[model samples]
Target: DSEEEQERIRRILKEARKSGTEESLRQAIEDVAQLAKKSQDSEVLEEAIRVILRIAKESGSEEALRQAIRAVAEIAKEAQDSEVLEEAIRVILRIAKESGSEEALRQAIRAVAEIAKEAQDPRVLEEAIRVIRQIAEESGSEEARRQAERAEEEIRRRAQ
Candidate 1:
């Protein structure tokens, strides 16, 4: 049953990407995001995250990106599974690199911050801070730098 669901999820995501319509893609992302939260299979959740990232990359809409971020945030919040959180963060970082948008990096930083807050792991918070710093340094946008500063402050507060 899980395998079947994964296949279906993959198909939906593929079609949504091909269609290039935000509505279809968002729906597909939401469906897989829900499955990622419910399914006990780590592989399933991982695949779902991959699909979510794919959609997010293609859509590049603030709404779609937020949906992807929220979905991963939900998984991180509920599972408290470091692996899932790490993978989600990786996806976000990848998206930020491809888009090079301050907003995108900010969203990724916020997602990592939220996950760190829930995990209460100093290491996770530190890692998030590191990523935010890297993004700020790499990003030319003043907004990205400001957000990176905020993320650093948040991480310090959480770590303490």
Candidate 2:
């Protein structure tokens, strides 16, 4: 059943692109975001994240991009390993790069920061920080800049 669900998820992702309507893609993302949270299959979640990333890249709608970013953030929260966090960070950064809205940038930073807060591995934290710093610099948001440092500071506080 899980395997079948995975395939259905894949189909929905393809349909999101092929449907050629913002509403279609948005609803598809919402559908899979729920699956990303529920499915135990790591591969399924990864594919879902990838699809979200693709949607973010292909769609012009800020709403779609935010939807994808928010979904990926939620998926990253449920994710168990550093690898997933790394992927999540990459996609979040890509969204930040493509995004024009301050809200989108803020959401991406918050997602990375939140993931970094729970992260155990230094490499994951380091990469997330590096990306956050770049987003702050690129987007010229003091909020992002403050958050870049905040993640590291929060991590340090926990370690001590």
Candidate 3:
């Protein structure tokens, strides 16, 4: 089943990449992220994931980038793989810094918190706290800082 789906998924991803609109890219993220959950063919999923990340960076729209980070979070949840989640953490951090939108930064932090909770790894939770603290330090919003604090507390409790 997985073997037969490579060409099918590839065609879908290729078409979406060529479409090159915010809407299309958003749909591509949704489609590929969903596909990644079902497919064992990581090669295609990896390419699609990279394309989605590139689209998010190249689009220059904070809203789309936020949504892209959200999709990556979903992928990390669905795949439940360390490598996938690690890449997601890096991508989320990049978006948080690059966009510098309080909304995106908060989303990125919360996404990591979610990942850390699910991961049940001390190192991953610590990494998440580090990222959240970084955002808290840079964030002008007191509410975001509080959210970061709460997330750290939550992850710390989960780790214990």
* Model with the higher lDDT, candidate 1 or 3: 1
| Ranking of all predicted structures according to lDDT, beginning with the best and ending with the worst | 2, 1, 3
In the range 84-140, model 1's lDDT, one tens digit per residue, is 666766676766666666676677778877777787656666666776677676676
lDDT of each: 0.75, 0.79, 0.72
Sort order, TM-score high to low:
2, 1, 3
Q: What is the lDDT of candidate 1?
A: 0.75
* Worst 10 contiguous positions by lDDT, candidate 2: 151-160
Return the TM-score for each candidate structure.
0.81, 0.86, 0.80
- TM-score for candidate 1, please give it: 0.81
- What residue pairs are clashing in model 3? none
Give the alpha carbon lDDT tens digit for every residue of 63-139 in model 3. 77887778767766765456666667777777677688888888888888877777854666667788888877777
Q: Residue 5 of candidate 3: its Cα lDDT? A: 59
- Winner on lDDT (2 vs 3): 2
User: Which regions of candidate 2 deviate over 4 angstroms?
Assistant: 1-5
